[PDB]
C-alpha cells in the first residue's frame, strides 16, 4: 500500500502470498486509510478466518471506476481493464492519493483502456495495443476512418471533482479450496495466569484445569505430553515453549 | 531486441528550419513512443517533445511550443521533428528516445536511445 | 517549476572507498526520482527510476532510499571505470528537471 507503484490501472501488477500472517486491524482499517469494502463476508469474519493463498492486484483508478470493482459489475474499466465474475470473493482496499499524487495541470501517467474489441475474461490481463476497431474495420498500426486507440489518461489535477481523483485501489483474492491453513489474520491473542482452575487452549487441545509448573523433560519436537491411559498431563507453552 | 536508428549531422543557417529523423525497428511500431531530447556542449540534457504514432497525438515543453512540431509515419517506421526559427545557441546533441513506459505497467520514463545528431547553428 | 539541489558539487575517494550522495527536491514527494550516469560527453546510462527500483543489468553495487523533499544515493566502493558524473531527475510532473551533477574521481 505505501509503494502507491500502481499509477496506470492498464497492465495492473500482480502478486502471490502465502505462509503468512494477515493483520487486517492494521490494514486498511486505521485511519490514513479512506474506504475498504468487501464481498460475500464481513471483516471480523475474515479476520477470524484462514485461507490457503492471497493473490493481490493493485491498481489507481477514478472515482468514476472504483464503483466497478466488484463482482458481476460492467463499464470500461470492468469491461476493458479489470473484469470479475459474479461469484467473485475478495476485497478491495481503496485511498485516494489526490494530495500527494497529483499536480495542478500534471497526473497524464495515470493510462487506462477506454475501448477494447471484445470484453476481458475473468481475472484476465492484457497489455496489446492494438487500434480499436472504432465503427470501422481495425487499422493494423495505421491510421483509417476512425481507428480510435483504445487506452486513455485520467490526467487528474485539483480542477477535478473527488470522483475524478487518482484513487490507490488494491484487491485481494482468497481460495479456500484444498486449503492447508498458512494464511491468517488472528493477532497475538495471548494471555496467561495459572494456580487456579481456567479454561485454555494451546494451539487447541481445548480444556479445563490449572496449570502449574512442571519438572518434566520435554524433548524439542514434543509439544504436549500425555500420562497413563492418554491423559493429557503438561503442555509447551507456544510462546514461552 | 529494440533499436533506434538516427540520421547524421546537418548544419543549416540561422532562421530556417532543421530536418531530423530517427527511424525505429524490432517488434510492433505501434507499441512504441518516441521521445525527443537535446543535449549542449557541457549543459545539462533538455527536453523538446513526445508523440505517440499511434495515438496520432503529440505534445510539446511549454519553453518550446509552436516552435518545435514532430511528426511519425508508420508507413517506413521514421519519426520526425521540425525546429523553426533556429539561433547560434540550437548547437546541440540531438537524441531520439522511445517512451516505452505507457504499455507493461511502466510510467514516464524512457529505456531506448538512438545514435544522436549534431546540429550546428553560425553564418 | 520544480528545482532540485544536489551537493556536495564533488566527491573524491580512492577506489575501494565508499561514496554517497544526496538529491532534494522543492516540495516533499514519495515516488518518481531517478538517478543518471553521464560520462564525458556520452548519453547518460540508467541507474535507479523508482525509489530504490534498479532496472535490469543494474549491479548489487549501487542503492538509492529516501523520502519526502530529500533522496540519498550510495555508493559502496569505486572503480576506475564507474568515474564520471551522477545526476538526480524528477519526473512526477511533464515539466522535467534535472541536477546540477556532481562528479567522483580517484584519490591517491
Known amino acids: 500500500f505505501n509503494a502507491t507503484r500502481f499509477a496506470s490501472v492498464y497492465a495492473w501488477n500482480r502478486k502471490r502470498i502465502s505462509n503468512c500472517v494477515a493483520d487486517y486491524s492494521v490494514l486498511y482499517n486505521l485511519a490514513p486509510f479512506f474506504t475498504f469494502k468487501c464481498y460475500g463476508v464481513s471483516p471480523t469474519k475474515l479476520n477470524d478466518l484462514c485461507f490457503t493463498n492471497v493473490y493481490a492486484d493493485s491498481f489507481v483508478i477514478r472515482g468514476d471506476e472504483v464503483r466497478q470493482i466488484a463482482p458481476g459489475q460492467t463499464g470500461n474499466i470492468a469491461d476493458y481493464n479489470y473484469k470479475l465474475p459474479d461469484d467473485f470473493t475478495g476485497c478491495v482496499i481503496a485511498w485516494n492519493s489526490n494530495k500527494l499524487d497529483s499536480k495542478v495541470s500534471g497526473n497524464y501517467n495515470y493510462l487506462y483502456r477506454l475501448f477494447r474489441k471484445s470484453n476481458l475474461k475473468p481475472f484476465e490481463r492484457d497489455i496489446s495495443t492494438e487500434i480499436y476497431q472504432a465503427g470501422n474495420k481495425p487499422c493494423n498500426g495505421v491510421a483509417g476512418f476512425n481507428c480510435y486507440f483504445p487506452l486513455r489518461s485520467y490526467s487528474f489535477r485539483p480542477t477535478y471533482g473527488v470522483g475524478h481523483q487518482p484513487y490507490r485501489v488494491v484487491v485481494l483474492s482468497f481460495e479456500l479450496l484444498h486449503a492447508p491453513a498458512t494464511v491468517c489474520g488472528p493477532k497475538k491473542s495471548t494471555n496467561l495466569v495459572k494456580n487456579k482452575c481456567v479454561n485454555f487452549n494451546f494451539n487447541g487441545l481445548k480444556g479445563t484445569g490449572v496449570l502449574t509448573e512442571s519438572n518434566k523433560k520435554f524433548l524439542p519436537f514434543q509439544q504436549f505430553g500425555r500420562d497413563i491411559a492418554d491423559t493429557t498431563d503438561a503442555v509447551r507453552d507456544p510462546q514461552t515453549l | 531486441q529494440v533499436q533506434l536508428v538516427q540520421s547524421g549531422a546537418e548544419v543549416k543557417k540561422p532562421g530556417s528550419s532543421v530536418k531530423v529523423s530517427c527511424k525505429a525497428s524490432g517488434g510492433t511500431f505501434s507499441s512504441y513512443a518516441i521521445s525527443w531530447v537535446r543535449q549542449a556542449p557541457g549543459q545539462g540534457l533538455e527536453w523538446m517533445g513526445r508523440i505517440i504514432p499511434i495515438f496520432g497525438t503529440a505534445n510539446y515543453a511549454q519553453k518550446f511550443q509552436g516552435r518545435v512540431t514532430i511528426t511519425a509515419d508508420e508507413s517506413t517506421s521514421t519519426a520526425y521533428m521540425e525546429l523553426s526559427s533556429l539561433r547560434s545557441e540550437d548547437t546541440a546533441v540531438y537524441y531520439c528516445?522511445?517512451?516505452?513506459?505507457?504499455?507493461?505497467?511502466?510510467?514516464?520514463?524512457?529505456?531506448?536511445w538512438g545514435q544522436g545528431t549534431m546540429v550546428t547553428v553560425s553564418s | 517549476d520544480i528545482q532540485m539541489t544536489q551537493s556536495p558539487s564533488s566527491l573524491s575517494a580512492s577506489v575501494g572507498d565508499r561514496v554517497t550522495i544526496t538529491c532534494r527536491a522543492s516540495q516533499g514527494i514519495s515516488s518518481w526520482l531517478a538517478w543518471y550516469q553521464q560520462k564525458p560527453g556520452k548519453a547518460p546510462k540508467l541507474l535507479i527510476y523508482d525509489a530504490s527500483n534498479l532496472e535490469t543489468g543494474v549491479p548489487s553495487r549501487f542503492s538509492g532510499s529516501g523520502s519526502g523533499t530529500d533522496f540519498t544515493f550510495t555508493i559502496s566502493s569505486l572503480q576506475p571505470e564507474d568515474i564520471a558524473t551522477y545526476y538526480c531527475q524528477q519526473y512526477d510532473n511533464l515539466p522535467l528537471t534535472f541536477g546540477g551533477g556532481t562528479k567522483v574521481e580517484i584519490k591517491r
Open positions: 528516445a522511445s517512451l516505452a513506459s505507457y504499455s507493461s505497467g511502466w510510467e514516464d520514463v524512457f529505456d531506448i
